[PDB]
Design a binder for these strands. Structure first.
Lengths: 190, 259, 108, 174, 137, 62, 72, 204
RNA sequence: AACGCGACGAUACUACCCGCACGUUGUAGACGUAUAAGAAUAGGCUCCGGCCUCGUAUCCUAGCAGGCGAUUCCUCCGCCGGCCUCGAAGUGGCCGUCGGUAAUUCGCGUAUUGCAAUUUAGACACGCGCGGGAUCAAAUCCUUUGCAGACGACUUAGAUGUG
């Protein structure tokens, strides 16, 4: 129908500096730096108030206006991770074979790796390399819990999902074999 | 038969080419990657097997082994190559002085009546200014080439053959910067390289040669039966084959007298 | 010295004959003139003399260079291509060859 | 259907002895020319009454020019069109300058969205909407917004088609 | 809170915005028809810049940096002419880089064969002192 | 059975190459390079350090 | 479906003269069969509600109906 | 405007493949020599898997009796993907069509004669001017690499070196533009005012 | 790839190379065949002043088809040397010598081609010329071999040698 104007708003907290190039978005704050490229969507970024980012499209369709809603949440997610961060808590359960989980930090390539051993008695080791920017720690607070924390929700949630998919039973009965590692809590560090 | 070896024609050259050297990384030490030898024949050995999981574990096995006679190759050259959108291009070949008559026989089809003038002017540029043409051509390899090869030839007098014409082949240097392998190649000039230094015992190697020729045969023996896919008569044999994963069981010295 | 030029003609290219899909008529040639893009520009060049200068192998009257003469007849299409009739039809191997389009006879 | 003009066509049945001074019907017809306007008159009168060209005559044909061809107006067109299923009703709005221009905009619009032909479209009413609240469709509503102003992103420059080769790459900003 | 955005800066079509057409004349938007048509009027006393009031496609128009400040929507030719002279649109157009380059094209097209000869030789006298200054630098 | 080009067969072979067969081949290449090193060790234009020119279908003939 | 990696044989959109001539024939006797069955034999929706002036059009209908009743 | 040049070097980056091929084929048959560079950077409109499906359909068509003779030779290189489009728009089985093809040279990357020449552009086939802002496009270099082109990494390294040298050339170019503007300012104070007033009145 | 390409060795004749001298020498077609950033297109460039639809731009552009002297100058162009640089199918920069040079100005020539007739002019390649440098080779046949073989073709050996 070619709507003439459509706009949305991203509020910015006082401890942040948001810098936008052509469509490259950089958010700085207490916890670190996040960048992501938005050249695949036609959008006009602007400044409306002291702490408000204005994003507009002109002469777009219903599809192009709706693509403004995904970029508003994506930038707002970068605001949250830079301020408060993200935390995924994962529990691993077993019936007879205890699951040994080992987390080391690689000096080269600068990323954590999680090694899963003894999954329903299997002798294969399962190595999962994490995304750059997510730290994994063994919970010395409850039994059989890992914490995946970081600034990027994309990096934390994908690395958590990689662990689930690497410990998955095959050629068995789902109703009886309940062994696996599962995401228990999702939220913020602060 | 296999459609992978489909152009069942005679091999284009008697020697047969490598067609693929190992992929090179600069972190490795400098080493050569190939060699040449002459097929002598086969013998029978007994090996005390150590194969955990085998029925012949810690037992005696009788195996057939092949003997290849390897006089020490003499390094005479150095060839640099550059990367291109069209492929790989040879940029500079640098030979040495005092080239032997054996490899000089290779550049002639009638050695017995020629004036033997090959590389006579090339021997003069090593003492023309101070060797400026030689050093310039090596610096061209160092600053422009991405991988360098070594020209080495075998000697037929050490072998019991009626041939006198040496076999000249390019051997790739792997594992280092282009500057490092060039200083290998110039230092290795005029020097015999033994098979003790190229290969080692207990190592799978790759063997490349041209098979036994059988001439014109029909479909009974050429294909193995009771367009390209239709079994038709033609040449069997004298084909280029690359064989894979053959163990080096021993490397004899020749001096030892108890091989 | 001077370091200038001596061109008193407008460069052209011989494109094709007058044709439809399949029938070609060599009596009229189609010429592309340097820098013309409408029929209004092509109206200036109507009646101007066209020379096709080529090379031969035998000297005849002190020269080895031969010329076929013609003149611009009418504009062709909307793109400033023009129709030219010569005393003899131009060779078919000269499709894409250059012609010289001269400013005489002049009405300016 | 081209540069249409509005015509005032008045026609009547031929005067007879039984009925002198006949009925005198009048229509407004959007036609490309004089000759088409007579033909659409007798086609429409044949469906309504039993008056044809053989027993009827044209009294007057006049062109109805716009009162104000320099003032922007919101128009409403009520129309019927015939499809494979049957006859349907639509009401569409057009922000134009003249009543003929709204009819040209309608014919191209019905050909574009619904593949309707001139022979299938019946224009019943073309009404100038005097007040802003009478506009009902959202595509006209955003045009009559208060303090309406918009930019023009991604404007491809007008480069001559005979300029095959350009030296520098063009820009789509101004 | 620091926000550093450098995205775009477009000129907007609006009531009172001065357009430049392909003919070289000036028009001023009075009311907006659609997203690609506007109603404009050029009341200028210069014949080179005068445009009759009518519909102009925006594909045939170029947006100038000149906006008449408080021009009413739907204003007729009397009101537009008063605001044209009060704002001095002709004087502000003359200072624009678009009119300066257009005037350069008019002078270059009007050169006679003699004028081209004197242009060329006077350039050579100017180029000489540019070349001595460049050699000093 | 599994193909020779199976993904899990390839991943098992990569674990064999890195952890078992890797250091064996690196050790044998250090000895062989040591023996090759033993055998091999046993003005600007005038010196030729600057590289000049020795001693056409890409460009149309100009 | 792995049609991107391994496409099948294409369905040709080139029209044969043999099939073009039959389709024009089969379209012809369908029109004849439709005309024969119609020969064999055995509503105004009104002004739209979104029309802004249905009210003043309806009163024109009532006023003309009064004038027709007065004339008759 | 409309000009006859010796050789027109076209930069293939940002161009639609078929729209550039029809313009080039017309100039070749008119008697114009054309060199196209950067054919790994051309674009084909539509999604990438549609261009991949078309090439996999092209790979199916192979002759049965003898693939070495007469079969469709499937060229994987980005220069030859472009050359196939141009050859289908030229009567290449006639002598005139063969002569037009010899006026064309197609390259991957920018060869060292042509990195110092000026690369022209065709606005009539440029992607930014032709395509809708929301539509999807693919690059010929990406399609070539997935069907067997072996020198994507070689061309990329050479283009990085070519742009490293061109950054040095631009730095000398900016200095020349700075020095030319300073020399013009100094010469304006020593020129006779009748020379400059006449040049201003003439538009120069 | 027997009509795709690279590196190197030796190249007797002829003439392999250098200089300049001309061709009834051949062309899918010279006539200023002048012009390098990269990158984005819902953004860029910059001398940081500002600028951007627009290559209708910039350079070059005058003189018997285009002299000799003067003043004025280190303005523009070209050849050879030294230093370096340029490998994707390989070149440009700096310095120096020499030569030419309306940037301002000047003295003396052009007629008759008769009122137009391609303005025979460029480039690469191919030849013939001199007068100078340089060079002193291979292959096939024949005999032989059998790692090969229907015939061709292929691996070899025939010059004093570990033949």
């Amino acid at each position: 129908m070619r709507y003439i104007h459509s706009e949305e708003t991203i509020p910015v907290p006082e401890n942040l500096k948001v810098s936008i190039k052509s469509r490259l978005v950089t958010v700085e704050g207490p916890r670190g730096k996040l960048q992501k490229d938005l050249s695949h969507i036609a959008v006009n970024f602007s400044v409306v108030k002291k702490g408000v980012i204005g994003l507009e499209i002109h002469h777009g369709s219903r599809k192009d206006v709706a693509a403004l809603r995904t970029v508003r949440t994506i930038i707002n997610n970068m605001i949250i991770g830079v301020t408060k961060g993200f935390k995924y808590k994962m529990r691993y359960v077993y019936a007879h074979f205890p699951i040994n989980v080992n987390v080391e930090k690689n000096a080269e390539t600068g990323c954590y790796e999680v090694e899963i051993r003894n999954f329903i008695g299997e002798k294969i080791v399962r190595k999962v390399v994490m995304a750059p920017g997510v730290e994994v720690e063994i919970s010395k607070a409850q039994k059989d819990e890992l914490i995946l924390s970081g600034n990027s929700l994309e990096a934390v949630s994908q690395s958590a999902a990689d662990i689930q998919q690497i410990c998955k039973v095959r050629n068995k009965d789902i109703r009886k074999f309940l062994d696996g590692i599962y995401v228990s809590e999702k939220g913020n560090i602060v | 038969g296999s459609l992978a070896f489909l152009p069942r024609k005679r091999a284009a050259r008697h020697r047969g080419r490598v067609k693929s050297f190992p992929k090179d990384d600069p972190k490795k030490p400098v080493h050569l990657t190939a060699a040449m030898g002459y097929k002598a024949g086969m013998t029978t050995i007994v090996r005390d097997l150590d194969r955990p999981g085998a029925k012949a574990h810690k037992k005696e096995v009788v195996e057939a082994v092949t003997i290849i006679d390897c006089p020490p190759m003499v390094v005479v050259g150095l060839v640099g190559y550059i990367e291109t959108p069209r492929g790989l291009r040879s940029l500079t070949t640098v030979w040495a002085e005092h080239l032997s008559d054996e490899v000089k026989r290779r550049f002639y089809k009638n050695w017995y009546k020629s004036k033997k003038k090959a590389f006579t002017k090339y021997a003069k540029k090593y003492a023309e200014n101070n060797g400026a043409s030689i050093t310039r051509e090596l610096e061209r390899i160092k600053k422009y080439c991405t991988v360098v090869r070594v020209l080495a030839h075998t000697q037929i007098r050490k072998t019991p053959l009626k041939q006198k014409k040496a076999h000249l082949m390019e051997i790739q240097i792997n594992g280092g910067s282009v500057a490092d392998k060039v200083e290998f190649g110039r230092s290795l000039f005029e020097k015999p390289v033994t098979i003790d230094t190229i290969f080692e015992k207990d190592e799978m190697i790759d063997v490349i040669a041209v098979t036994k020729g059988h001439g014109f045969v029909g479909v009974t023996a050429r294909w193995g039966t009771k367009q390209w896919t239709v079994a038709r008569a033609g040449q069997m044999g004298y084909h280029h084959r690359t064989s894979v994963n053959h163990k080096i069981y021993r490397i004899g010295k020749g001096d030892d007298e108890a091989n | 010295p001077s370091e200038a030029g001596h061109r008193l003609y407008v460069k052209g290219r011989h494109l094709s004959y007058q044709r439809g899909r399949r029938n070609t008529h060599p009596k009229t040639s189609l010429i592309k003139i340097e820098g013309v893009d409408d029929t209004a520009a092509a109206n200036f060049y109507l009646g101007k003399r066209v020379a096709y200068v080529y090379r031969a192998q035998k000297e005849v009257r002190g020269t080895k260079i031969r010329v076929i003469w013609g003149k611009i007849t009418r504009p062709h299409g909307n793109s400033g291509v023009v129709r030219a009739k010569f005393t003899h039809p131009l060779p078919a191997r000269s499709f894409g060859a250059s012609v010289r389009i001269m400013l005489y006879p002049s009405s300016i | 259907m081209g540069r249409l003009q509005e015509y005032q066509v008045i026609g009547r049945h031929l005067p007879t002895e039984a009925n002198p001074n006949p009925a005198l019907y009048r229509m407004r017809i959007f036609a490309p020319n004089e000759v088409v306007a007579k033909s659409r008159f007798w086609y429409f009168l044949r469906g309504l009454k039993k008056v044809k060209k053989a027993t009827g005559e044209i009294v007057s044909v006049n062109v109805i020019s716009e009162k104000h061809p320099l003032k922007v107006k919101n128009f409403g067109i009520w129309l019927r069109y015939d499809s494979r299923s049957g006859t349907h009703n639509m009401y569409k709005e057009y922000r134009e300058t003249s009543r003929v221009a709204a009819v040209e905009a309608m014919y191209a619009d019905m050909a574009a969205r619904h593949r309707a032909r001139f022979r299938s479209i019946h224009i019943l009413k073309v009404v100038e909407l005097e007040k802003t609240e009478d506009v009902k469709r959202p595509y006209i509503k955003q045009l009559v917004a208060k303090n309406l102003s918009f930019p023009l992103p991604h404007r491809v420059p007008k480069i001559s088609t005979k300029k095959i080769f350009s030296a520098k790459r063009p820009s789509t900003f101004s | 809170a620091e926000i550093n955005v450098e995205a775009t800066s477009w000129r907007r079509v609006e009531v009172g915005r001065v357009l430049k057409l392909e003919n070289g004349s000036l028009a001023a938007i009075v009311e907006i028809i659609d997203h690609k048509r506007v109603l404009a009027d050029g009341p200028s006393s210069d014949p080179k810049l005068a445009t009759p009031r009518g519909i102009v496609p925006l594909s045939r128009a170029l947006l100038t940096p000149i906006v008449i400040p408080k021009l009413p929507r739907g204003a007729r030719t009397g009101a537009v002419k008063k605001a044209w002279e009060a704002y001095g649109v002709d004087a502000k157009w003359k200072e624009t880089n678009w009119a300066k380059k257009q005037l350069q094209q008019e002078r270059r097209q009007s050169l006679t064969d003699f004028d081209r000869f004197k242009v060329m030789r006077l350039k050579k006298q100017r180029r000489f002192e540019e070349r001595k200054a460049l050699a000093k630098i | 059975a599994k193909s020779a080009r199976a993904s899990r067969i390839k991943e098992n072979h990569q674990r064999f190459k890195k952890n078992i067969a890797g250091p064996v081949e690196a050790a044998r290449l250090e000895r062989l390079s040591a023996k090759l090193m033993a055998i091999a060790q046993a003005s600007g234009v005038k010196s030729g350090k600057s590289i000049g020119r020795k001693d056409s279908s890409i460009v149309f003939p100009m | 479906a792995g049609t991107i990696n391994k496409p099948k044989k294409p369905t040709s959109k080139r029209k044969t003269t043999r099939l073009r001539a039959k389709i024009s024939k089969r379209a012809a006797e369908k029109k004849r069969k439709e005309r024969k069955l119609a020969r064999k034999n055995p509503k105004d929706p009104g002004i739209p509600n979104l029309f802004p002036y249905k009210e003043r059009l309806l009163q024109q209908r009532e006023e003309e109906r009064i004038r027709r009743k007065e004339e008759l | 405007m409309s000009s006859f040049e010796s050789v027109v070097v076209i930069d293939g980056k940002g161009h639609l493949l078929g729209r550039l091929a029809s313009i080039v084929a017309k100039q070749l048959l008119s008697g114009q020599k054309i060199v196209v560079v950067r054919c790994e950077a051309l674009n084909i409109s539509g999604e990438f898997f549609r261009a991949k499906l078309k090439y996999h359909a092209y790979l199916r068509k192979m002759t049965r009796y003898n693939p070495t003779r007469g079969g469709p030779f499937h060229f994987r290189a980005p220069s030859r993907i472009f050359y196939k489009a141009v050859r289908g728009m030229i009567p290449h089985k006639t002598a005139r069509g063969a002569a037009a093809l010899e006026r064309l040279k197609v390259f991957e990357g920018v060869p060292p004669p042509y990195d110092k020449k000026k690369k022209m552009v065709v606005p009539q086939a440029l992607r930014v001017l032709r395509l809708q802002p929301g539509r999807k496009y693919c690059t010929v270099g990406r399609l070539s690499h997935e069907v067997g082109w072996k020198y994507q990494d070689v061309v990329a390294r050479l283009e990085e070196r070519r742009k490293a040298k061109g950054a040095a050339y631009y730095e000398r170019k900016k200095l020349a533009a700075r020095q030319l503007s300073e020399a013009k300012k100094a010469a304006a104070a020593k020129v006779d005012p009748k020379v400059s007033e006449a040049l201003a009145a003439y538009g120069y």
